[PDB]
Amino acid sequence: TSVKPIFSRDMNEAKRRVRELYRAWYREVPNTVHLFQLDISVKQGRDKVREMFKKNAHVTDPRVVDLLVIKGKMELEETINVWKQRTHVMRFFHETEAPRPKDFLSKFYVGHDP
Amino acid sequence: TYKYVNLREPSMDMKSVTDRAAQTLLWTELIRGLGMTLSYLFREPATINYPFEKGPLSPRFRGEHALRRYPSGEERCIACKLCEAVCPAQAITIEAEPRADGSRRTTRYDIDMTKCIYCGFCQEACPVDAIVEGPNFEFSTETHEELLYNKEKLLNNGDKWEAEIAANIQADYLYR
Amino acid sequence: TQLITVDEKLDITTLTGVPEEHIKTRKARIFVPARNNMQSGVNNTKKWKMEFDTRERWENPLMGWASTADPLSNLVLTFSTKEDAIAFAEKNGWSYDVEERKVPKPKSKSYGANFSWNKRTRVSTK
Amino acid sequence: ASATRLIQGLRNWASGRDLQAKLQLRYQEISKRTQPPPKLPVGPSHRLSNNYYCARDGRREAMPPSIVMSSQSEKKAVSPAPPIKRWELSQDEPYL
Amino acid sequence: VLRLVMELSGEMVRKCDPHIGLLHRGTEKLIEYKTYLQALPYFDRLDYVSMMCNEQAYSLAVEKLLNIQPPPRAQWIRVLFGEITRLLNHIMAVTTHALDIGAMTPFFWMFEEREKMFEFYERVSGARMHAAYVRPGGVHQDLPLGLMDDIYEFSKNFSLRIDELEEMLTNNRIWRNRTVDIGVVTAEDALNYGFSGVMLRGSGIQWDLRKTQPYDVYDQVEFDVPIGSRGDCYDRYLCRVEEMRQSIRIISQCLNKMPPGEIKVDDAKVSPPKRAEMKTSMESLIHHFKLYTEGYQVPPGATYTAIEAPKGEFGVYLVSDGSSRPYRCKIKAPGFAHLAGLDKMSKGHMLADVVAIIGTQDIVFGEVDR
Amino acid sequence: GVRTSPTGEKVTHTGQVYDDEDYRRVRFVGRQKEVNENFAIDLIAEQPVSQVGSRVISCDGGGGALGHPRVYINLDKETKTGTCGYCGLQFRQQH
Amino acid sequence: KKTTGLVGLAVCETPHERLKILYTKILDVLGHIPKNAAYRKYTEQITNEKLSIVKAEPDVKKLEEQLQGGQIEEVILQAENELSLARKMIQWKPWEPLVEEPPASQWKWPI
Amino acid sequence: TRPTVRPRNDVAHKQLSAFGEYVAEILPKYVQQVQVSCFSELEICIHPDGVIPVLTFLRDHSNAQFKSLADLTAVDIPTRQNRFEIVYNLLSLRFNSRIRVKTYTDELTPVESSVSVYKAANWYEREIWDMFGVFFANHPDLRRILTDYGFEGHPFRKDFPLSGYVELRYDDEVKRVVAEPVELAQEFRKFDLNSPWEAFPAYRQPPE
Amino acid sequence: LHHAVIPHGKGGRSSVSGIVATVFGATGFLGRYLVNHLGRMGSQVIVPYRCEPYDTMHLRPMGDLGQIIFMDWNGRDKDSIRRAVEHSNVVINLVGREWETKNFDFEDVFVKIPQAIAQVSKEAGVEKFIHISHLNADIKSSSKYLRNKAVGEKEVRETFPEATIIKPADIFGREDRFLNYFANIRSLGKKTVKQPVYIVDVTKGIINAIKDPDARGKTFAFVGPNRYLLFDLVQYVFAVAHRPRDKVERIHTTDRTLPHLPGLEDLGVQATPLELKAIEVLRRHRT
Amino acid sequence: EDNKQFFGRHRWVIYTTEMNGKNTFWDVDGSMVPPEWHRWLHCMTDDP
Ligand SMILES: NC(=O)C1=CN([C@@H]2O[C@H](COP(=O)(O)OP(=O)(O)OC[C@H]3O[C@@H](n4cnc5c(N)ncnc54)[C@H](OP(=O)(O)O)[C@@H]3O)[C@@H](O)[C@H]2O)C=CC1
């Protein structure tokens, strides 16, 4: 079984590149929320950024981690330019409900969603 | 075989070079262009007075999506679903039932005017020429609700005229 | 060029972008599609269709149509073997129900047995 | 058209192309409509007594693709095709 | 309609990212969920200015896979409408280049001529622009009596009008100043960046798909494709106008070389029959019925072909299960291939020259999407 | 030739007329429910039942290659008229 | 010559000896390449054929009409790119036997 | 058989057969299939390691020039472990011939980014990365071009359905355009057109 | 009840939700946002207008295909109003100009309009009728506005007694009146304590109360989260905006809470503060 | 219908006042022609 990985040797370089990518996203947020004339506090945006990071913490396969790093770098480039507009940046957020909780009885009233 | 362009040289003879200098310093072929455009000025322009004169067409235009019916008879459609089987944006919607008589017929025959690309495939696919692309093209509808035809709208639109449709088909039932 | 490679599993569901509601809630089914019984021809066999289970389809209150909030409702994936079907379903994340293939059973019939003498297999009509 | 001669001369002086002759306003050679009804021909089939569909079965002439080397002193190194001959300037007024 | 993010040193450039994909529609996926005969109009309208050569390429793809040759009258009529489509796409590319560069009026002159050509499409089929009309299996529902003389009339009047277009422009001094120095293309660039058709005509190498691999009866008409010398945009303009004039030649020889064979193939299991046998047969009614419900089965395999769209190499790559549905279609687009080298075509110019570069390679921005 | 339901509007040639508890009646406010006022079943009794002296006879539809395809119908039902599934017009036998 | 039909390519004045030193460098870099493969055989055969075309002809236009690759300087550029593949194919060992196989149920089409 | 059925040339078939046999003999390290169809267009089927060496050979060598680069796509075939098929298409300026370099690849392991020798492959590789996810190591810039920015899913796969998962609408609540889960107005009906009865007897695969 | 009034599936874009709402007004501010949130819910809205169809045209495409419907009404006849409320699940009453006109006072819109519509409603058989009112509209002085609203409050309370009489405080938003007057200044300085409530929490509360039964009969009042001085709020407005008689009396008149009636907490909606939405809405200053 | 104009100005309609009753002296719509004149006026024929 021969598999050629992207960048990784163990998860140490994975941790290193993802913490540098998070540093880049931290210094990415205030410039963009000032540039696009947005309407959201910096605390909420940074907490949703780190929540999106903490969503996919369950991955140990290093090639998948490499491909996540490359995708995040792509969208950090495309938001550090002015290539993406106000619509996509708000589309990362969810301010328009979408109210659906995970209760059993709530899904039993508005039914057929098991 | 090839016939290419731009293979010459500016002629070093005195007459040709002073003619190019005369065009350079005397604005000549610009005024030649003005003369050609004034020649098109003194023509009569080819316009049509739109609400009174309508532009020419063919006997095989594809317009209104009208229906036909039998001579002093019932509805020409059978609901054989060929038009919905061929409809390349699936705008036809047929739900069929037989009535109390016994001949097979419909319940719901809907054309979406949004999705209708106006091919002609439902005309060519109809074995009995039930649906016919109509002659007139004036829909111009102020509301989006009104652009979803029902079968009764199609029957009224096929009973506002057949004589146009019958004349066009009776002229050109031999090509197709 | 003879790099890291480790013999493990695959986790493409964090990449293919379909949301986790549709990941963990919807369920797949892998089956050979049965012969449509009115015809008798089994060219519609030899393939392993992967489908998703059906969900709600209400009435469109202006035209009488069946709208749905199901983008995945009209997927089908015709495959060639059960192994690659299960491998792809486990590769892309969601759950799956395996139904097994059923060939027509071979029989033993003959026209002379339809013209028996003291056996009850008799055509009785022709 | 349908205009007097002085402005016609001014059109032909501003553009010496004989504009009165062909002006892109069609008058005479509009195709006279309501033509006689045509009888179409039927081509090299409906020919009785010989049209076996077994012969002209171009759907069933689809061979599977032949295979050379796989996963399971030679006079060679030819090209996939003969090399393409360079064209010629066409005589019908080339440049130059 | 495009997005362009250019990064420029002042009244000049440095780089430019063409963000394209605005006009994405999912055409390959929709053809993968349909049949052949039903999904032919997607091929008709992925490109839209050229409109019958796309029909021609898809029909020849299916006929080449299906090993069925159309009757010869169908081939010559297909050649005639391919020349109409060639003439139409080149004249619209010239006029939209003129309108985007300035030059208000010749746009409208040549669009009046194109209004005559849409009247011809109407008299042929009925549609204004997106006439399908080219079934795989030859042309369907042939021309009404009284069309070829109208095409003859258009050929005479349009030779006169295109000579008057070269009277107006072409030795226009400041239009020559506007587009001569821009748009240089090396032959190595024309190979590596994968250019197609008119760019290859304009920059160096003598190359015609029509002449090298005659996919139809183009081999039996005398015409000569114009070539470029300096690899240049004014030179490419002259190449387009002389390809129009060659299309006038091919129309004249096609009208003089017309055989009266038949409309469609005499293989009713591929092309549907006509109305008389349809209303009194049995085999033809069955063939009509099942041919329009299911679609004819197509033997498995992957084919590719490519014809000369007025942009360039219009390629189509079919992948077929033994089925009435294609398993995977894909389209090689000359607009995409021409847009692919925009940085190296516009490394050393300014923004109005970039708009002239977008003009001088004929664009529709629908076909660039695939 | 239409019924008037207690809702109060025009009925059609399909049994689809509304209930009183509907909102689609009130979205019909201001614009008339246009319907074909020339129904289908009533144009069957208007057609005379033809009587042909043969036994197994033809139906085309009034025009070669204009209509529905050929169908040959039987008249063995002694009291029941032959009925084309396409046409809808009847036939009888006269020995 | 005088202003050939190509664009980014001006005419050369000594085509013959330049082309000959090009093909002798082709023979040298082919002499670097090992023996037992037939790649050396096909390259050596076609290069000796083309060199035998050029050595027997001091002409120009007859040399174009005989030796393919019209008109002239494309042969020189193509010789440069042939030297480029020669330099790149000292390395990369194209003549050595195969790397491992596909799973063998892949290149059969009709699925 | 002769009218209305396209005749062929066995001469071009023999030429492409001999040429493909030649290429298969002189690059043995990566050649797996050299197949020739009925109408003489060559296909060479290649392991995903000899991408750069085979393309550097096929750009040059004065026996197969093939400067012209065309399509790149990786035809999504399931029932395999190596799913995607990277299809290079090459056209010869000098010889007028078409070869299809089909190299095979899986979901996650990169092939070696042909933009190093092919300057036309840049936006082709960016397109394949956007629509599929075939990663390209040693590439200058990989971005999302021909998709929306905030959209993800790699939609030209077979796992991505016809309709998208998201659907935009404007709303005056937050005074802007937002995305929602898809609420179709109609079904996109599905016609079971795969008829039985074996329309091609020659392409029968052996059953079990 | 008949089918196609029951909910169906998920929400949004012609998913058949519960209520069919006849709305009076909706060309103004709060009714437009309320039609917006019912279109997000996916509810059919029957709205009559009286003005040019251009206003209902630029608020037309809020719904999906043919969901909302437009008709005519007038402040004089019961026939057009009754025709508008022939078949309705719920009905809401929002009306009022904040200056007297030639043909209408503060009297008889707030008085005469709920009389006839409540008459044809109670003869019609509608349910969950929601009538808005300004907060602290008393019998007391200083406003024909507030006293005619108090008379209308007593009318809607007396006839058809199980109406949800609802009142927010003075709401601010994208098209506020009093923050616009804070922008359209010049000045004068007074004192009044005041709580502002943002508009989207108000209309979310209204749609939640109208879709949630068993919460009927009780009058509701909406509460601003800050409740401080007016002049400090004016200083806050000028600070965030970078620059240094009936409406001004009706903002200086009265702003209090009432411990009698229930508010936000019996509905379960998060309150958005003044500061966040005020920073969001205070655009259109110098650069 | 006049002959001396070009193809596009042969056949022109002159609408009248209140054929349906909507004061169509001014504001003349399209499709106010019967369908046989909709065949004639759109240049689909050469005979009235
Ligand atoms: N801070 C605030 O503004 C608060 C307001 N309210 C109340 O909320 C309601 C809505 O406020 P708002 O949107 O700002 O004001 P609007 O004037 O815009 O709303 C009233 C609506 O009814 C219509 N209308 C009013 N009078 C007449 C009339 N005589 N004839 C016909 N139509 C009439 C209006 O115009 P049109 O006719 O063109 O449709 C509009 O559509 C008001 O009743 C107000 O008292 C309550 C609490 C706080």
Ligand code: SF4
């Ligand atoms: S094809 Fe014709 S007869 Fe058949 S269902 Fe359609 S309209 Fe009716």
Ligand code: SF4
């Ligand atoms: S013309 Fe319209 S209704 Fe007919 S098949 Fe085409 S899209 Fe469907």
Ligand SMILES: [Zn+2]
């Ligand atoms: Zn009949």
